[model samples]
Target: ALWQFNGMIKCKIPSSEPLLDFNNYGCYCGLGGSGTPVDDLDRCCQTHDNCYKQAKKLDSCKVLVDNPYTNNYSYSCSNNEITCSSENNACEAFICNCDRNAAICFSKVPYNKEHKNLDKKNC
Candidate 1:
């Protein structure tokens, strides 16, 4: 999972990779989704409830999830909001590699084939 700090020490140094091959699928809809594809971290009908509204993660804060995206798709807490990168997710993929922080990731496998996203445990 993107958010799990398991191997930071192993891959500290890295080389640049092309950006064209990245993608980020957003968080699940909990139990409120219609299960169509989306880019929202929460229900579209709801607003950020401060926790999810955060632009950057609290330095002291702690927090998904996997079949995770690439580290390229990793979302850092930015501008007090969760995002895949410096850009405001204008377009992208949540591809993973050696990145700086943890990210929320899950499989669209079940969602794509079964029309139902697996839970975090499965991720």
Candidate 2:
């Protein structure tokens, strides 16, 4: 499953000077990891790669399964999205790995053997 980043953290560093350089500050996501500071924390989305990559490094992360069916398969993590169509019936199940802020889904054992074509594509 594909993974993405979706979360924010505030820097607690105190500055005495009138000019504050947020870029020099450091903060942790509270989920248990540190990240670079930004002038505008909301702009974090612009650096999705950095945030997602850092978040992805966390342990036991998983993706969230939105749609699970023999004909249709769909999953998402943060900003990343993946889907499987009925053409790929061979797919028995899917495993997703995401950070703490993210959720994931895994395939249930004993998949439907009748749907041999489901596995054609990556779930």
Candidate 3:
């Protein structure tokens, strides 16, 4: 789409993983696919949108979705192969990651959270 400014290509990171937020859903921030949540997904996508804006300034940077078995769900940026970590603790249904090398971007946060739960069973 000729996305460039000042003769510079503003390539965005690929949303290959099902990164999660406080709400805990799948797909690229709930912007793709069916049954995906919308509330938190918007926030997730917004954050990534801002991140991509930041990426253009960096020589090399990528988003990280840390989904360790320790139940620490997080999002981070790696500049020049230097990984970043922190007290990312939020266990959920999914956690997506677009590391050092990414090609595309976009995904659905999977399940409508309250709706899905309401559709799944009666509490």
- Which candidate number has the best lDDT? 3
Candidate 1 C-alpha lDDT tens digits along 1-123: 323212221232122121211122223333232343344333221221222323223232221222222222434443333334455231122222222322222211122323234343433
Candidate 3 lDDT over 10-116, as tens digits, reads 12323222233222233333233233324444444445434444533433222343222222333333331212134422221122132211212222333345532
Task: State how far residue 33 of model 3 sits from its true place (Å).
Answer: 13
lDDT of 2 by residue, 40-107 (tens): 33123224324445444334222431321111223332333333233422231221112212211111
Which candidate do you rate higher for TM-score, 1 or 2?
1
Clashes of each: 24, 19, 10
True-vs-predicted CA distance for residue 88, candidate 3, Å: 18
Error of 3 at 34 (Å): 18
**Stretches of model 3 off by over 4 angstroms after superposition:** 1-38, 59-123
Q: In angstroms, how far off is 29's CA in candidate 3?
A: 2.7
Instruction: In model 2, state the lDDT of residue 123.
Output: 20
| lDDT over C-alpha atoms for residue 92 of model 3 | 18
| Best candidate, TM-score | 3
TM-score of each: 0.18, 0.17, 0.24
